[PDB]
Design a protein around this ligand. Structure first.
Ligand SMILES: [Ca+2]
Ligand SMILES: [K+]
Lengths: 52, 393, 49, 76
């Protein structure tokens, strides 16, 4: 219940990873998407979801 | 009575009071030549340089731009008369034997040459040029234009223009400053009397150099043409040559999006009217895109579509000749337009009458020479009924 | 259904939420007593009996 | 074998045209390969857009607190 909420959790090592992960995502969201178009002609299950 | 005057004051009048004889007259304006395919592009797999007997192999396996090549406006006039219509040719020829021969060629074809002027001090189909070595490359400059490219605006036959319900010209005249000025006067007169303007592009060799440059030259004549005929290569070149080539070369990586794509047939792509918007204008009553005699993509303000055709140059391998096929399909269009005014606003009858143009083009590919083997109306009508099921004719 | 066009002959290769991908197949009717040449899943080229 | 034993060490002076990398400066389809043990050699087929096609879309799938909405994702 209430004692089991997130605010009672440490998760700091995972939180630091999320901080690094979010920073990496912003700096590579566009870069990865362009590579998908450059290499994968047609979208297929298992490929990067691109476009709309 | 002044051809060079502005077509806004008193007409040429004269004593025409009785009704004109059917079918409606058609004016074909520009140079007069025999053969002389204008559309020239660079093609791969050339045959033997000297052994011309092998060159038939490129007639039944032609370059995609030369599938139904056009010609001079004289071919359209000659082919139109053999289809039953009446055509008058406007142009200038020299006083030499060739000018007499060319006029004799059109006279024997029942083409009204009353609009043909004679330049005594000129040599027919003869352009005097000066060779100059500029930047290490040999070039030439037109010192004196030929009589074909030397028709003054004061030499126009207003009697032809008033009667002519359709005015036909090519983009070859746009390569001559003299004829380009004369053309706009003739178009202005023709619009005054109510005739329709037909623009068969047939882009000559210089006009294939650049898309932007060509569209600027065509811009003025394109905007005043009620009917325009272009080939697939011409239309793609005007819009984007590389874009439509990439679509043809595109193959889905994993699977086809429909069963028909698996067959990997020839790409008979029908351009959407949105892709035609850059080239469309208010006065354009009809635009036809001809993939040879295979597809006739027609476009009207109200509707658009494609008419499926065929080609069988292989049925007579030794007498097949693509030359003049584009003239035959154009002449077939004008033959029916002058007789079926409902075509511009009835899609069903538009397809049926365009099949006549398809059949005319097919026959024109079965004989060596353009004017030598332009089909007769009965020959064209018979092929249309044989090729198509009776529901399509 | 009524609205959907007919399905070309083949085997259902991919099933998705809305669309289905079919691998083209050509059924040959065979009467009893005929002799099928080739084991199951054997590759046949054009013109092979 | 054993590239040491390559008289091709003198083969370049013969009719060879190997670049010294000091002055030198579509087709698709998946592999459909299976082992038919009667041949002792796997046979190959190519599945491409010329064999597999897509049937048009249709509706054939018929479905039978301090918290956020359920979302497909990792649990850890
Ligand atoms: Ca043409
Ligand atoms: K011909």
């Amino acid at each position: 219940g209430e004692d089991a909420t997130v605010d009672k959790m440490c998760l700091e090592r995972f939180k630091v990873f999320l901080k690094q992960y979010n920073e990496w995502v912003e700096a590579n969201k566009d870069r990865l998407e362009e590579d998908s178009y450059k290499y994968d002609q047609d979208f297929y299950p298992g490929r990067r979801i691109r476009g709309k | 009575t002044n051809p060079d005057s502005d077509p806004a004051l008193v007409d040429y009048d004269d004593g025409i009071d009785f009704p004109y004889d059917d079918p409606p007259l058609v004016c074909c304006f520009g140079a007069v030549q025999k053969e002389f395919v204008p559309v020239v592009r660079v093609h791969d797999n050339p045959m033997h340089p000297d052994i011309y007997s092998q060159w038939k192999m490129l007639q039944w396996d032609p370059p995609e731009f030369g599938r139904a090549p056009g010609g001079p406006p004289s071919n359209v006039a000659i082919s139109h008369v053999r289809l039953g219509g009446r055509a008058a040719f406007m142009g200038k020829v020299g006083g030499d034997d060739y000018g007499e021969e060319l006029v004799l060629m059109m006279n024997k074809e029942r083409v009204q040459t009353r609009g043909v002027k004679f330049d005594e001090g000129a040599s027919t189909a003869c352009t005097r040029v000066k060779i100059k070595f500029e930047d290490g490359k040999m070039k030439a400059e037109t010192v004196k234009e030929p009589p074909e490219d030397s028709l003054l605006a004061s030499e126009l036959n207003l009697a032809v223009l008033k009667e002519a319900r359709i005015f036909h010209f090519n983009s070859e005249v746009l390569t001559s400053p003299t004829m380009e000025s004369t053309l706009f006067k003739a178009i202005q007169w023709s619009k005054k009397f109510g005739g329709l303007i037909f623009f068969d592009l047939n882009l000559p060799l210089p006009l294939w150099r650049s898309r932007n440059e060509t569209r600027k030259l065509i811009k003025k004549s394109w905007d005043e043409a009620n009917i325009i005929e272009v080939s697939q290569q011409e239309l793609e070149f005007l819009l984007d040559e590389e874009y439509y080539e990439r679509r043809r070369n595109y193959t889905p990586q994993y699977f086809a999006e429909d069963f028909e794509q698996t067959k990997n047939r020839r790409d008979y792509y029908h351009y959407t009217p949105e892709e035609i918007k850059p080239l469309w204008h208010d006065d354009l009553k009809l635009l036809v895109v001809t993939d040879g005699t295979l597809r006739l993509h027609y476009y009207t303000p109200k509707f658009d579509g494609v008419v499926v055709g065929t080609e069988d140059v292989l049925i007579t391998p030794f007498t097949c000749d693509r030359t003049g096929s584009g003239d035959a399909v154009v002449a077939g269009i004008m033959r029916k337009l002058t007789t079926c005014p409902e075509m511009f606003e009835d899609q069903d009858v538009l397809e049926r009458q365009l099949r006549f143009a398809v059949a005319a083009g097919i026959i024109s590919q079965w004989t060596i020479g353009a004017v030598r083997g332009f089909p007769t109306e009965s020959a064209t009508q018979n092929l249309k009924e044989q090729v198509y099921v009776p529901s399509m004719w | 259904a009524k609205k959907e066009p007919y399905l070309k002959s083949g085997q259902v290769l991919i099933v998705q939420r809305d669309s289905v991908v079919i691998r083209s197949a050509k059924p040959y009717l065979a009467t009893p007593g005929a002799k099928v040449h080739g084991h199951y899943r054997e590759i046949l080229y054009e013109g092979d009996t | 074998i054993r590239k040491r034993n390559n008289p091709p060490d003198s083969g370049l002076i013969s009719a060879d045209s190997m670049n010294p990398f000091y002055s030198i400066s579509q087709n698709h389809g998946t592999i459909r390969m299976f082992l038919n043990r009667n041949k002792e050699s796997q046979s190959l087929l190519i599945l491409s857009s010329s064999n597999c096609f897509r049937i048009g879309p249709f509706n054939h799938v018929k479905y039978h607190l301090i918290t956020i909405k359920n979302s497909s994702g990792p649990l850890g």
